[PDB]
Amino acid sequence: NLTNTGNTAVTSFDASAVTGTGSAVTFVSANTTVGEVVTIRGGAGADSLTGSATANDTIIGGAGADTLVYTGGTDTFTGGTGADIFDINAIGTSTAFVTITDAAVGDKLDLVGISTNGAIADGAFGAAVTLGAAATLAQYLDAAAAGDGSGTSVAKWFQFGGDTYVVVDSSAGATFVSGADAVIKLTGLVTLTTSAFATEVLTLA
Amino acid sequence: NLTNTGNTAVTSFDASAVTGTGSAVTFVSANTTVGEVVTIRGGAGADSLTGSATANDTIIGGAGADTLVYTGGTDTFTGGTGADIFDINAIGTSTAFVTITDAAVGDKLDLVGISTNGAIADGAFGAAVTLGAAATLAQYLDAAAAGDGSGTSVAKWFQFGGDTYVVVDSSAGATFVSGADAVIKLTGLVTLTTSAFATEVLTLA
Ligand SMILES: [Ca+2]
Ligand SMILES: [Ca+2]
Ligand SMILES: [Ca+2]
Ligand SMILES: [Ca+2]
Ligand SMILES: [Ca+2]
Ligand SMILES: [Ca+2]
Ligand SMILES: [Ca+2]
Ligand SMILES: [Ca+2]
Ligand SMILES: [Ca+2]
Ligand SMILES: [Ca+2]
Ligand SMILES: [Ca+2]
Ligand SMILES: [Ca+2]
Numbered sequence: 191n192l193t194n195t196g197n198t199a200v201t202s203f204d205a206s207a208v209t210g211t212g213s214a215v216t217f218v219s220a221n222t223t224v225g226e227v228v229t230i231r232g233g234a235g236a237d238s239l240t241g242s243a244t245a246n247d248t249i250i251g252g253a254g255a256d257t258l259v260y261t262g263g264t265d266t267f268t269g270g271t272g273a274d275i276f277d278i279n280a281i282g283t284s285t286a287f288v289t290i291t292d293a294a295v296g297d298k299l300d301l302v303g304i305s306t307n308g309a310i311a312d313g314a315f316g317a318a319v320t321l322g323a324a325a326t327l328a329q330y331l332d333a334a335a336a337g338d339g340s341g342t343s344v345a346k347w348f349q350f351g352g353d354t355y356v357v358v359d360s361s362a363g364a365t366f367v368s369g370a371d372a373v374i375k376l377t378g379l380v381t382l383t384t385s386a387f388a389t390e391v392l393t394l395a
Numbered sequence: 396n397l398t399n400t401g402n403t404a405v406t407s408f409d410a411s412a413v414t415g416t417g418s419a420v421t422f423v424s425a426n427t428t429v430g431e432v433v434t435i436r437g438g439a440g441a442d443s444l445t446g447s448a449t450a451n452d453t454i455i456g457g458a459g460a461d462t463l464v465y466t467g468g469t470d471t472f473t474g475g476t477g478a479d480i481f482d483i484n485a486i487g488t489s490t491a492f493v494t495i496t497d498a499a500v501g502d503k504l505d506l507v508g509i510s511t512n513g514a515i516a517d518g519a520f521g522a523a524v525t526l527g528a529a530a531t532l533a534q535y536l537d538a539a540a541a542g543d544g545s546g547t548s549v550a551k552w553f554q555f556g557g558d559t560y561v562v563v564d565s566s567a568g569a570t571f572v573s574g575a576d577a578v579i580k581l582t583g584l585v586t587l588t589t590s591a592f593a594t595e596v597l598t599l600a
Contacts, residue, residue: 225534
């Protein structure tokens with residue numbers, strides 16, 4: 191567990207070679223260079239890797255129960271093998287958002303930090319939003335955020351262009367507003383039909 | 396020296412074949428067709444070529460001490476050999492701005508006409524604005540205009556995507572405002588570290 195405060199030149203953290211059941215690595219980037227490429231690599235342990243709001247973090251856990259934290263910007267997450275938790279603590283934009291490359295059965299998606307108004311669903315909330323043969327990503331977003339999230343934030347999801355997306359609606363109108371509504375990309379078609387919301391924590395089934 | 400008033404159909408001025416130490420050509424386009432492509436070519440002389448605010452002027456001096464004038468729109472400047480002066484008399488937008496293709500040691504950049512509030516630096520003002528490995532042009536602009544230009548306009552510069560940019564901040568907030576803040580593109584990496592501001596006139600060192 192490495193305290194990293196004030197080490198702001200760091201653009202590559204590579205703990206990938208580390209080895210035990212639980213040789214657990216903790217790291218938090220102190221980088222504040224706007225628009226930086228930062229690479230964070232975990233090891234065999236149950237690692238805890240946090241990026242920077244400033245940065246386009248590529249975060250990769252190894253084996254084991256990794257926690258990858260989103261803070262802002264265009265981030266690329268890969269928890270390798272094991273029950274990884276993708277802890278989403280920022281809203282992002284419509285362009286600067288987190289892509290999770292390898293979301294699979296067992297991995298979790300912790301949305302506690304985007305419950306702007308209240309606290310998410312809590313059900314098994316799992317019928318995909320379906321739109322027309324030529325609906326745009328913009329359209330699918332607007333469709334997903336159609337409801338009222340002013341008093342209570344809601345989760346929805348869809349599949350566009352070969353990738354899977356999750357949304358948090360925290361707004362009035364049927365516009366997905368870049369500011370307070372949130373999108374999360376997941377590489378590939380992953381069916382979240384049967385998957386359930388723990389507290390505000392989605393466990394993939 | 397050709398008086399050109401009222402010759403508004405002119406889209407190609409080609410004085411390129413002209414020959415002496417100082418066979419000096421003066422031209423000013425009278426063209427007012429919105430969104431026109433106008434081509435202005437100088438000769439061996441110390442030429443004085445002005446475009447149109449209306450137009451996307453390609454201006455090219457030959458040999459000798461050419462003065463190329465920016466008035467508005469998407470302009471492409473090439474002062475050839477010699478101590479050329481790129482006289483910037485308009486602010487432009489964030490899309491319609493001047494690109495200077497061949498800025499080199501000896502060429503000048505006359506910014507007297509964009510000193511909206513007061514009069515520029517006057518120092519040798521020369522540390523490049525640096526941002527992250529994947530900072531956007533939008534980000535670099537906002538970064539460059541971060542300061543307060545309300546009482547006194549300030550110059551800054553950066554290098555994005557293989558080209559060099561110069562900025563004049565004439566505004567309050569850290570938004571580069573398209574209207575009153577100004578950007579100038581220079582093809583290639585040109586280091587303006589050591590280069591100095593005359594009056595409001597930057598001489599490349
Ligand atoms: Ca690991
Ligand atoms: Ca980040
Ligand atoms: Ca893992
Ligand atoms: Ca995994
Ligand atoms: Ca959280
Ligand atoms: Ca809404
Ligand atoms: Ca010439
Ligand atoms: Ca022009
Ligand atoms: Ca020339
Ligand atoms: Ca020259
Ligand atoms: Ca001037
Ligand atoms: Ca400003």
